[PDB]
UniProtKB/Swiss-Prot annotation:
Cu cation binds at H37, C84, H87, M92. Belongs to the plastocyanin family. Keywords: Chloroplast, Copper, Electron transport, Membrane, Metal-binding, Plastid, Thylakoid, Transit peptide, Transport. Transmembrane segments: none annotated. It comes from Spinacia oleracea (Spinach). This is Plastocyanin, chloroplastic. The lineage of its organism: Eukaryota, Viridiplantae, Streptophyta, Embryophyta, Tracheophyta. It is a peripheral membrane protein. Residues 1-99 form the Plastocyanin-like domain. The keyword Iron-sulfur does not apply. It is found in: Plastid, Chloroplast thylakoid membrane. GO terms for molecular function: copper ion binding; electron transporter, transferring electrons from cytochrome b6/f complex of photosystem II activity. Participates in electron transfer between P700 and the cytochrome b6-f complex in photosystem I. GO terms for cellular component: chloroplast thylakoid lumen; chloroplast thylakoid membrane.
Length: 99
């Protein structure tokens, strides 16, 4: 599935922000507006056994360009809470349920 990074209206948001995906299904986070953006999963908000370092972009990596995206494939079932480092304080966070 595809999630847009930033609304055209200026919102620093994941569109959709709360969504579901089946185990093994990919999620492609594409820059839309308001970038730089990046996608970082909260180590304390991801299913048991998942390595946040494998499913996250480095806090120092940013999708700085308009056509850039970040693809991640999640398998362990449960909810995962992720955010954008630069806009975390502005409310740019999201949740995905892997069923
Ligand atoms: Cl992992
Ligand atoms: Cu951002």
């Amino acid at each position: 599935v595809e999630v847009l990074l930033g609304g055209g209206d200026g919102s620093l948001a994941f569109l959709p922000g709360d969504f579901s995906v089946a185990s093994g299904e990919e999620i492609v986070f594409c820059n839309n507006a308001g970038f730089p953006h990046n996608v970082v999963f909260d180590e304390d908000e991801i299913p048991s056994g998942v390595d946040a370092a494998k499913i996250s972009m480095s806090e120092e990596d940013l999708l700085n360009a308009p056509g850039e995206c970040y693809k991640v494939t999640l398998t362990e079932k449960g909810t995962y809470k992720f955010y954008c480092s630069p806009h975390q304080g502005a409310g740019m966070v999201g949740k995905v349920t892997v069923n």
